[PDB]
Design a protein around this ligand. Sequence first.
Ligand SMILES: *Cc1cc2c(cc1C)nc1c(=O)[nH]c(=O)nc-1n2C[C@H](O)[C@H](O)[C@H](O)COP(=O)(O)OP(=O)(O)OC[C@H]1O[C@@H](n2cnc3c(N)ncnc32)[C@H](O)[C@@H]1O
Ligand SMILES: CCCCCCCCCCCCOCCOCCOCCOCCOCCOCCOCCOCCO
Ligand SMILES: CCCCCCCCCCCCOCCOCCOCCOCCOCCOCCOCCOCCO
Ligand SMILES: O=C([O-])CC(=O)C(=O)O
Ligand code: SF4
Ligand code: F3S
Ligand code: FES
Lengths: 119, 577, 130, 243
Amino acid sequence: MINPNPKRSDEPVFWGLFGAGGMWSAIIAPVMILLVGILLPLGLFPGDALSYERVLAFAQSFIGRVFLFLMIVLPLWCGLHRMHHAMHDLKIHVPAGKWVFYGLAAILTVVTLIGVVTI
Amino acid sequence: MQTFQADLAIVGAGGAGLRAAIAAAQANPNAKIALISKVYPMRSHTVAAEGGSAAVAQDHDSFEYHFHDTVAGGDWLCEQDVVDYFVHHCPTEMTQLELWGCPWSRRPDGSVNVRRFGGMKIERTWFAADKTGFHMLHTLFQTSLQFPQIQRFDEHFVLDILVDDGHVRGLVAMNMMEGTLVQIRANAVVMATGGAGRVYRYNTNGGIVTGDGMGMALSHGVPLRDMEFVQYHPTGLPGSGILMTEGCRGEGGILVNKNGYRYLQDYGMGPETPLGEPKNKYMELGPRDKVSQAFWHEWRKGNTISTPRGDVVYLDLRHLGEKKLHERLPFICELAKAYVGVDPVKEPIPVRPTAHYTMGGIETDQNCETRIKGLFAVGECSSVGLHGANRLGSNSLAELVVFGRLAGEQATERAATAGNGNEAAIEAQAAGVEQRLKDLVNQDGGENWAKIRDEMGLAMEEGCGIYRTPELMQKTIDKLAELQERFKRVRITDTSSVFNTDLLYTIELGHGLNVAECMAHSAMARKESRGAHQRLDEGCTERDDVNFLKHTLAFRDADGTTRLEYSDVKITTLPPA
Amino acid sequence: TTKRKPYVRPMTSTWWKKLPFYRFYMLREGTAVPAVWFSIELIFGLFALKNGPEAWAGFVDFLQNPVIVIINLITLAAALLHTKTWFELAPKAANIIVKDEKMGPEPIIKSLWAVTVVATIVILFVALYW
Amino acid sequence: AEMKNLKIEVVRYNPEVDTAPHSAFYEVPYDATTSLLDALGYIKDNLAPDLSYRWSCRMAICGSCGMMVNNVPKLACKTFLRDYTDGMKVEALANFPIERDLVVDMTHFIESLEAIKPYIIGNSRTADQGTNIQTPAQMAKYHQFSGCINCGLCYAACPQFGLNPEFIGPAAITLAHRYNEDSRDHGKKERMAQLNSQNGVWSCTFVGYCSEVCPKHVDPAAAIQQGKVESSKDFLIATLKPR
Ligand SMILES: *Cc1cc2c(cc1C)nc1c(=O)[nH]c(=O)nc-1n2C[C@H](O)[C@H](O)[C@H](O)COP(=O)(O)OP(=O)(O)OC[C@H]1O[C@@H](n2cnc3c(N)ncnc32)[C@H](O)[C@@H]1O
Ligand SMILES: CCCCCCCCCCCCOCCOCCOCCOCCOCCOCCOCCOCCO
Ligand SMILES: CCCCCCCCCCCCOCCOCCOCCOCCOCCOCCOCCOCCO
Ligand SMILES: O=C([O-])CC(=O)C(=O)O
Ligand code: SF4
Ligand code: F3S
Ligand code: FES
């Protein structure tokens, strides 16, 4: 018989993040991969728009710091959430899976946070 | 046999059985109610109701109006004191189902809307959409889950009942999955098994509607009343026999012959009304019977379109408009598309008359009790005497909750003041059910049950149809007699134990043959034409209130014979004339 | 005792390989990988960006591989498949009634795709015209 | 005339003889109208009387039909041979124990369904007062989700279920949702526990196959997503309440 008083799950926290994350990477991730993963390394940009100096200038700005953080972090919380479940879907036993993936997220999050308060 | 103790046992989880279980659970919070059904409750026929459930509600209406309607429609064969009780309780029952969550369609102000059915002058039929039965059965079922008092025996095929010294003591059923028999003891039993349409070749019914309950009561001296009145629905799909709600027409649909001529005008239901305004009582909205007969008549003239699935007439709905066609009547448009492959927006639907409802059923008093103390019947399988010789549209669902509540309350009382019975006798009954079952199992003969089933249906379809003649009724009686003899040479080749449907279908078939014979004899004997019963032989073509204003009681004795007896009809305020 | 012997069909780790609909599902979740990979890459860049032009050029040199260019091209495809599918799914979370009828998802799917296009433009403008 | 014939492969299983399910092949007459349910009948009537299966309405409204046709959950009565001239393999509804032939154990489903209290809760209105007032607008909130015939096709479609038999399931949750969304009910709290469970809405990763198959376009998937959102609100509320 079905448990009459089950334990509340904590998924709403991770789902939450994964949600905002999934939405951020849906609207803003395409363009960014274009700029950083294709335009930049192929010089396909006007003058010195993507030159060390200019990027650095951005990165160091307030808005640039925030954007940088979110652009990195939010996607992580999304995708790691997804790989965590993919494990199950694939029937791959992963010890403390929850700690693993979500921990990896937190660590990276922090790391990212250090970097944007600038190294 | 394992034994279960219950205050009352209900056989059937359809509209009636459920409404019954709940009323009993609310009546006695401490009772232990055994609800039994051979399919999970929601698979009961009730789920397939599409038109609506009657209940007085408009300001310009009156219980009187509903009473009259009911009585006239039943050609005065209604137990008038019962009809009264009925109309007065509908509003309460329909309202209660609303409180339980039944999503009745609404008026823009939030009130429940109503529509016309059964040819009533004042609309008073409540409705889900064209999924009313689905919604009522499901509301009821779900509502029942909150009462622990009700213990369900899902997929338990009730075999026979246990009677001793005129009082019911319980029943023997078979755990379908397990294949094992069980004893349920109860000082009250409510029969809510449904009708017997399935004894007909083409019907609107579900596989399960085999008349088991009626057959059971028959074995114990109880008589089935007015079994000759079988109601045919005018518009059903050829072959499948699947119902096409009266709604189609109430919305504007027309019926035409191979010449696209709206033939209904030539049968006293003219003058033709414009594609725009349908008018109750006229054309495609005329008397049910007249409409079904018109089909026959068109058939004689050779005006029916010939098709493999059979001859038909067309149900044209195009002139409604896609939005109404596709968006308003989803199911149908889906039913039609799926089973006859036809888009009601691009083409006409083939249809013909189909066996649909069983007016008859186990005889009961105004409290749904039978001649056997503690044995009650409610629902289509019964005969409270509400429908007489012709049920009114949307009155059957209403009945389910109105009398199911009563049956429930009354049964509770009857089990509380029952007293004890002879244990050795009751246990001997059970042993008998068991023995009988073994006999059927070991029975050999190499006769295929299925073919008997098929012949039974063709017989009823030819001998007990829309128009009857002594010649063909007799022919059917003789056929059934024969089939009864063949039934004893049937061999159930499947001796398995887990969900053995071969055996269960074979048992169901038996009840059907018995029930069929009460139908036929009843009809052959009613030398008159009333309601659903229409004869063509001289001196039998009209209604005879001088000699037949009475109920037909059909009894089946231990020697296998079907005897008739007649009872009077309780008049109160509406004498016949 | 029971004569019932309930047969339970096992479920392999390759269940999704059968039916396409599942395959497409796995594929949709698959986008997760390239997605983090990219986040990783952004981290590399971020820190290279701080260890001076010297390191940053070393980063840019990495992105020019060009096997990393193919991988990144795959990353862009995946990302778009994500956007495609995400917008379809997202609307199923809202229960909105527009005049007695449950609307969507088309109205919402359109909006999201509009926001994305405008964002893609404003971003490309900001990052390149100045 | 002359009807065409179709070799249909049916997966038989007798727990009193068989150790494991095994195919069987029957030749069945058929035309542009013949349905799988029709075919099953013909088989039981003329080729194999021991073929057991569930059914009733014959019009896709009762829901006992449930079974697999070439790995796709469907209703036997809404499946037509005309669409399987290149082979047809019929098996018991997936993700449920096979009891006998095409009949499975629907117990879990029932219990799950019972577990979410699918019934109007906490409303004191009584019959003599008249019915509740509910606008079409209000009804539109849960209507689609009330058309569920408990057929079981979504459970055969859901991989999560196949992987977690303790998952209450699409239908179960939809039903719960349906009441939580009915303006007449006041027992949402009575239902959340089960929805919040790991075995509740959270067991679902939105594969979406369930809604793909609902023979009654209920869209359980959409109900579950909305469910998560409510669960989520519940989880917050519960957090901002100390002690
Ligand atoms: C066929 C039909 C009838 C119908 C209709 C549409 C169709 C296609 N539309 C209607 C409408 O719009 N308005 C209305 O007034 N009536 C309409 N009807 C007729 C009406 O709905 C039916 O007459 C009514 O459904 C009868 O319901 P009832 O409560 O009497 O019971 P049931 O639904 O037929 O179910 C029978 C139950 O009994 C169980 N059973 C039967 N035999 C056994 C045995 N041997 N052992 C254990 N259980 C048994 C079944 O399992 C079932 O639960
Ligand atoms: C920078 C903010 C990080 C905050 C860290 C605080 C962690 C505290 C965890 C406590 C969680 C308590 O749950 C409370 C809810 O009421 C129910 C109590 O019974 C226990 C239920 O199970 C616990 C649920 O929490 C599970 C895990 O939460 C992990 C946090 O991950 C968030 C990372 O933030 C990074 C996003 O960019
Ligand atoms: C810097 C690395 C920190 C790792 C952060 C990982 C956070 C991931 C949290 C995931 C928690 C998952 O719960 C797993 C247990 O299985 C039971 C599931 O049912 C729910 C039970 O309630 C959840 C309990 O976990 C609570 C997490 O508390 C957060 C940890 O704080 C760590 C701080 O480390 C800093 C000290 O040096
Ligand atoms: O079913 C219908 O639409 C009309 C009818 O006669 C019935 O209620 O049985
Ligand atoms: S949600 Fe659809 S597939 Fe699922 S049980 Fe209900 S009707 Fe069947
Ligand atoms: S397929 Fe299963 S994963 Fe969720 S969307 Fe349907 S219940
Ligand atoms: S027989 Fe009723 S759902 Fe198919």
